[PDB]
Structures are given as structure tokens and as C-alpha cells.
């Protein structure tokens, strides 16, 4: 009694309409507030099937987040070609909060409810939605942060693990916390993670893929050459951009189960995201940064020639920030009644 078909979502929030978080205050006049009584309702022995590698939902998620991260953070000097702006950069405050989509009226939001759902195929334990969840728009790479876990097992997620140049994301069911300080040279910090858990997670890595790949011997190797924010773990903490140093968690070896110490920097100049260019900023605040975050995702592309081979190489990856989107809206999707 429906169909497929892509639409105009919009979106809804708890933002406070008082706080000056850049977060908050786009999302007190772009976004309705919340949904007061979220009524999901469940749909009796129906299939429907989802892919979300064609969803429409992520591409609407990501104009959006474009325009908050182009509303909202002030460089010193924006760059790109054939121009050159340079207006002024003081000092704010960043931190990303649940934002909700919604469908208008005639469209409603399909949810898929089965635990092992890899993002395609049909779905079994399907329930209508108005609206998602509260989703963090966390923009990283390598790592997925502040995310949403699995409800069982790891999960292998790609449009097809037969390309190489199709990325995997991998949903993990124990989140890893990650402890990245600035202490009161000032562009200087690192990242505490827990070399237990992590090996442990990474060792129920590497079998999941054992899995999917032939019983192949797997490596994790750092990346294959790229700009710094792709073999940097680039992340957004407060406001200064941080880049981080993953080798230590990319090793084969792992007296290795301490605490994995990880060198980072504040850099000031960045190659922004949306790819338009370059940017720079000013230096970071005049006290000591700290994020804790919660490791959720990974991301990860393999080296195509191993054919012949008898293992196979996956170095941490990103850049499309659609995939971090994608990490959260792959049990929805959009349908007209
Ligand atoms: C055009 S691009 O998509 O190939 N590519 C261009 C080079 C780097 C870009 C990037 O990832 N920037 C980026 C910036 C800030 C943060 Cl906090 C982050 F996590 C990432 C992506
Ligand atoms: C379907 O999903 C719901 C919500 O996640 C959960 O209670 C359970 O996994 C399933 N319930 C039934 C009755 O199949
Ligand atoms: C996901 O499940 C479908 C079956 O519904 C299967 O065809 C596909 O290969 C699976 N993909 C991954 C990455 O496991
Ligand atoms: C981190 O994960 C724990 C459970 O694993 C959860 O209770 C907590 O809210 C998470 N924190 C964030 C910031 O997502
Ligand atoms: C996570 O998944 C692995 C296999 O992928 C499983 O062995 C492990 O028990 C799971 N852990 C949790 C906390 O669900
Ligand atoms: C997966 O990728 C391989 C290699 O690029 C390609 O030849 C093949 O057609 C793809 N398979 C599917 C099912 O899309
Ligand atoms: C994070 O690390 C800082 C310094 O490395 C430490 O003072 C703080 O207690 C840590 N916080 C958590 C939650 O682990
Ligand atoms: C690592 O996690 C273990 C539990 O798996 C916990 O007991 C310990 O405090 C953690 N150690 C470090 C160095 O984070
Ligand atoms: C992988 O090896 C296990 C034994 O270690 C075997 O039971 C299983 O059939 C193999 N699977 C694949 C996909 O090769
Ligand atoms: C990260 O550190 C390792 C040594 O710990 C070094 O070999 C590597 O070049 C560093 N990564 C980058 C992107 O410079
Ligand atoms: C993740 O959430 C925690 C708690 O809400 C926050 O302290 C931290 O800054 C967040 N990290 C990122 C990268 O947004």
C-alpha cells in the first residue's frame, strides 16, 4: 500500500533556543522542534528491502550539514579558485547535537528492526517511523565517533566487497573510548585509547572479515599515500581540528596492552571536507582541550592485485563524509503513501 520515492525531508531538534552552541543555534531556525509524542508504529508481516548505498536520505543529510559547517565556523581566510576571502575568525563554541528527520505529509519513514541487517537485502522486522532518531552529524575520518553500536555482532558493511574502490564500514558492538588532550608548543596533543579493548575489538575484526573474505590472512596497514586529513585520524574537537596519528592501532603485532598513546596536532590551515579548498583558522582556545569520545565505526578500503595472494590488506580510510552519514541512516528509508 505504498512505494518508493524520494522526497524533501526536514528535520527536528531539542536545540536549545538560548545556548550560542553554532550547533543549537542553526538548529533553533532551521529545524522544528521535536516530535512530542514519536509514535512508532509496527507493520505486520511485511518485507521490504533496503539499500543504503542508494538512499536518498544521506544526500539531504548532507547539504545540511554543509550548510550548519558554512553557516557556522568562521575562517581567517576562505580560499578557492579564481578568489581569495579573508574576513575575521573569533572565538565560538562547537558541539554536535541529535538532529531528527522527518517525512511531510503523503510520505512516511520505513524502519528496518533486524539486528544482523548489513544495509541491503530485504528486511523482515520493518516498523514505520515520522521521524529518525537523534543522529550526532560527526564529521571524522578513519574512525566513526559519538555513534550509534550493533545489537549483536560486528557488521560488514559495503556496496560491494569485490571492488577495491568501494569503502567498508565497519559497525561495532562495543563502543572504545578515545581521550584526546590539549594540556595548558601549543598545537601539540594525543589521544588515550585502551590497548585492551581495542586489540580485542580489532581481533573480532579481523575474524569478522576472515569471514567475508575466504579465510584470507588479513593486515592492517597505515594508509596508502593521500593528503594528511586521510592518514590522519581529522576530527573537530571544540573547534580545533585534530589530527592524529593512527599507527599504533593499525599494527599486525598486538607487553602490548596498556594504555596506546597517540600523537596529535591542532592544525590551523585544513583542507575542508566539502571540497572546495583550503581554509585556515586561529590558533585554539587559551586553556586546555580535552574530547572524550566514543570509537563506534571504522573505515577501512582494500588493495585490489591479490588475486594470487593468500592475504589481504585494509588501511583506514574516509573522506566522503556521506559514509559517516550513511553509518546512521542505513535502516531507513523513504516511502509515499
Ligand atoms: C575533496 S576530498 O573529499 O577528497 N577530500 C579533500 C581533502 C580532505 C578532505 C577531508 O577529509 N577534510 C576534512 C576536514 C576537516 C575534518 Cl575535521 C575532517 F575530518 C576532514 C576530503
Ligand atoms: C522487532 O524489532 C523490535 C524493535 O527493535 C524488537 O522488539 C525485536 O527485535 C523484534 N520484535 C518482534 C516481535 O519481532
Ligand atoms: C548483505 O546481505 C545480502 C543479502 O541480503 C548479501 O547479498 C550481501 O552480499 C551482503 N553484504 C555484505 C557486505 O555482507
Ligand atoms: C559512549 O558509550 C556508552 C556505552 O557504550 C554510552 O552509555 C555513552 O552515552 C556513549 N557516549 C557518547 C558521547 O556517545
Ligand atoms: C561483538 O561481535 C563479536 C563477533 O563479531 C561477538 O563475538 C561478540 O560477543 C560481540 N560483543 C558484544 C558485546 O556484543
Ligand atoms: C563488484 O565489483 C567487481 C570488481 O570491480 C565487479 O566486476 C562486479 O561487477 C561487482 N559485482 C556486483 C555484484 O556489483
Ligand atoms: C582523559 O585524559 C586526561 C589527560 O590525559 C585525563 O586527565 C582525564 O582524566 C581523562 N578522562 C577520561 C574520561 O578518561
Ligand atoms: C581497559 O579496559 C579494561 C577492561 O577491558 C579496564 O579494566 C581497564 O581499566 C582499561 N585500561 C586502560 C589502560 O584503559
Ligand atoms: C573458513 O574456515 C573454517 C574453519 O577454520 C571453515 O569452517 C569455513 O567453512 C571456512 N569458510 C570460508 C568462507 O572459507
Ligand atoms: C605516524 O607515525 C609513524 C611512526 O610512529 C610514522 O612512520 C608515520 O609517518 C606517521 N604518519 C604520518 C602521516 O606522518
Ligand atoms: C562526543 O560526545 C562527547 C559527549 O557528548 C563530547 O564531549 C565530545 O566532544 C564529542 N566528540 C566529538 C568528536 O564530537
Known sequence: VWKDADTTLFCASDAKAYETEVHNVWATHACVPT???????????????????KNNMVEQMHEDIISLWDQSLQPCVKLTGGSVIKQACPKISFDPIPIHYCTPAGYVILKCNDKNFNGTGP????????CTHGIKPVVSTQLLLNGSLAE?????????????????????NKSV???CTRPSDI??????????????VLKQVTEKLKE?????????????????????????????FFYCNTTQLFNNTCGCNGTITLPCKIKQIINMW?????????????????????????????????????????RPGGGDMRDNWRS?????????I
Open 35 to 53: 516530535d512530542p509524542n514519536p509514535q512508532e508504529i509496527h507493520l505486520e508481516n511485511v518485507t521490504e528491502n533496503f539499500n543504503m548505498w
Open 177 to 179: 573510548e578515545i581521550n
Open 212 to 240: 567475508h573474505f575466504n579465510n584470507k590472512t588479513i593486515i592492517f596497514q597505515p594508509p596508502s599515500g593521500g593528503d594528511l586529513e586521510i592518514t590522519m585520524h581529522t576530527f573537530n574537537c571544540r573547534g580545533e
Open 328 to 336: 546512521e541512516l542505513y535502516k531507513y528509508k523513504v516511502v509515499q
Open 274 to 314: 566539502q571540497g572546495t579548498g583550503q581554509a585556515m583558522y586561529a590558533p585554539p582556545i587559551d586553556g586546555k582541550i580535552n574530547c572524550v569520545s566514543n570509537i563506534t565505526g571504522i573505515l577501512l578500503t582494500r588493495d585490489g592485485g591479490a588475486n594470487n595472494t593468500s592475504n589481504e590488506t585494509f
Open 152 to 172: 549483536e555482532e560486528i557488521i560488514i558493511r559495503s556496496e560491494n566487497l569485490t571492488n577495491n574502490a568501494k569503502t567498508i564500514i565497519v559497525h561495532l
Open 123 to 130: 528486511c523482515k522486522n520493518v516498523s514505520s517511523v515520522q
Open 187 to 200: 598545537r601539540k596533543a594525543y589521544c588515550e585509547i585502551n590497548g585492551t579493548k581495542w586489540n580485542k
